[PDB]
Ligand binder design. Structure first.
Ligand SMILES: O=C1c2cccc3c(NCCO)ccc(c23)C(=O)N1c1cccc(Br)c1
Ligand SMILES: [Mn+2]
Ligand SMILES: [Mn+2]
Length: 531
């Protein structure tokens, strides 16, 4: 069960890769320790390969089997349909990698005969050949981070593995309707992707408050995708086949798991053979649903193994939160050790071992945590934050560069209630949109796995719908939260919060004087700045 087998061949780039922040005049006003902000490249690909390559041992027991039976019973109440070639094309992402067979994502979306003809041929092949492993390409991702001191520092580039565009569209034809419906039915309230930030918070908080003495922990699996075995991917297929599906859907799902999901060969961007995969591919339709199902399965079983009492789970990828009743500090510590023992048997050991927590604010998963502030009436309001280091580092990058993804705008939307998105991100970018003549100009923005064309002036209305009117009135943030933000600004050389407020006082006035919907932005987004 070796997760990967490699050959000499290198994981290679497809174009120029920048690894370092530039020196913009605008960038330095946000952030002045510019040697801390980097970007992964193929140069580090080999370090990542080393980490993600190991033999997997997996030993199942009745806890696993009992949970899996309960899951299949739930799956058996799901019905799902085939998408037609046309529906799958229309649901294809705008900016996904072009096909080797002469068409790209925009051709797919506009139902180009070239795309449609090819996808029909790929479908027929999936139905008629259930064995030939399907080609994939492997690439090192280009993501922006901030360096860490106390940790090792510089992370290697993540690896992505994906089949051709044509195959990706067939995946949607066979499984889009499954992957969109099945998870919620099987996992119910534990299925994290159903929640907006406020609803996730509402779930964790009501869950937390229902225990007499609450204890929670997060868990995150070391190299999760590599820990996923052929057993795991076959179990997944067996859950999908519990569904009520069309005959042709069944055939394509079985075929896709034999030819693609289970494993297959890996090829370079130059066309060379890099090796063989026997674990989860990170770039298939089924990655998110599969990781979530498999993490839930193993974690549910592992909670029974550790005898955790009145457990409640929340799962996104391999990102897991558990909230249960405390048995006491030494009891909880021992239980956690037994929880990760079971998980490790099931093949999924943790990056860092979990730690029991008695303060909900201190539980981090999906890079996020719950925290408290007060609304205009002084009432306690709970909301989702995260450490602002990465959002700021990518904000500094996107100030100095094009970027067809606007992570700053995604962060303002998702984290609109936070101290840091309000004082720093909203101020910095409205200042730049004010100086350039560009308040009316729509921007591309990737959030919750989709690409939106966002008018900056729509932000008041977006934030209100997503978070509610309170997002414009929060005050009296937690000492821990305030602390973390201030210490992150010092670490990165971004100006302290008192500077951001002055700049925002001026940003607010300039928006107000500009009159219409610009002034609406000034009122709502920056009401915090003016007494
Ligand atoms: O406006 C400030 C502010 C201005 C200047 C300095 C500080 C501040 N001092 C930084 C010490 O590290 C801490 C918190 C806030 C703050 C702080 O929480 N706020 C604030 C109050 C209400 C809403 C919002 Br958004 C921010
Ligand atoms: Mn992980
Ligand atoms: Mn994770």
């Amino acid at each position: 069960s070796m997760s990967y087998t490699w050959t000499g061949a290198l994981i290679t780039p497809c174009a120029a890769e920048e690894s370092k922040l530039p020196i913009n005049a605008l960038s330095n006003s946000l952030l002045r320790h510019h040697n801390m902000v980097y970007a992964t490249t193929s140069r580090s690909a080999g370090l990542r390969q080393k980490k993600v390559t190991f033999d997997r041992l997996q030993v199942l027991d009745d806890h696993y089997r009992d949970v899996l039976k309960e899951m299949k019973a739930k799956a058996s109440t799901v019905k799902a349909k085939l998408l037609s070639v046309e529906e799958a094309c229309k649901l294809t992402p705008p900016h996904s990698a072009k096909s080797k067979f002469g068409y790209g994502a925009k051709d797919v979306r506009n139902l180009s005969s070239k795309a449609v003809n090819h996808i029909h041929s790929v479908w027929k092949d999936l139905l008629e050949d259930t064995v030939t492993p399907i080609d994939t390409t492997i690439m090192a991702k280009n993501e922006v981070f901030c360096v860490q001191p106390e940790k090792g520092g510089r992370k290697p580039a993540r690896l992505i593995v994906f089949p051709d565009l044509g195959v990706r569209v067939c995946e949607k034809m066979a499984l889009y309707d499954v992957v969109s419906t099945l998870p919620q039915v099987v996992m119910g309230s534990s299925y994290g992707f159903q929640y907006s930030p406020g609803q996730r918070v509402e779930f964790l908080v009501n869950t937390w408050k229902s225990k007499k003495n609450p204890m929670g922990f997060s868990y995150d699996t070391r190299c999760f995708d590599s820990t996923v075995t052929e057993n795991d991917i076959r179990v997944e297929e067996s859950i999908y086949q519990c569904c009520d599906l069309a005959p042709e859907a069944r055939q394509a799902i079985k075929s896709l798991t034999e030819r693609l999901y289970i494993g297959g060969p890996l090829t370079n961007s130059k066309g060379q053979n890099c090796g063989y995969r026997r674990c989860r591919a990170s770039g298939v339709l089924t990655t998110s649903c599969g990781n979530t199902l498999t993490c839930y399965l193993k974690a549910s079983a592992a909670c029974r193994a550790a005898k955790l009492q009145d457990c409640t789970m929340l799962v996104n990828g391999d990102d897991l939160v558990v909230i249960c009743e405390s048995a006491g500090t030494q009891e909880d510590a021992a239980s956690l050790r037994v929880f990760t023992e079971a998980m490790t048997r099931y093949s999924a050991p943790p990056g860092d071992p979990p730690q029991p927590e008695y303060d909900l604010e201190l539980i981090t998963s999906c890079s996020s945590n719950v925290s408290v502030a007060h609304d205009a009436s002084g009432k306690r309001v709970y909301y989702l934050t995260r450490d602002p280091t990465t959002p700021l580092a990518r904000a500094a990058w996107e100030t100095a560069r094009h970027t067809p993804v606007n992570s700053w705008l995604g962060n303002i939307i998702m984290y609109a209630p936070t101290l840091w998105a309000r004082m720093i991100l909203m101020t910095h970018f409205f200042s730049i949109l004010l100086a350039q003549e560009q308040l009316e100009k729509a921007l591309d923005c990737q959030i919750y796995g989709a690409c939106y064309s966002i008018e900056p002036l729509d932000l008041p209305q977006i934030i209100e719908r997503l978070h509610g009117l309170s997002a414009f009135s929060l005050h009296s943030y937690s000492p821990g939260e305030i602390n973390r933000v201030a210490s992150c600004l010092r670490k990165l050389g971004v100006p302290p919060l008192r500077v951001w407020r002055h700049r925002a006082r001026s940003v607010r006035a300039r928006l107000l004087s500009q009159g219409g919907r610009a002034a609406t932005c000034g009122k709502y987004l920056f009401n915090w700045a003016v007494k």
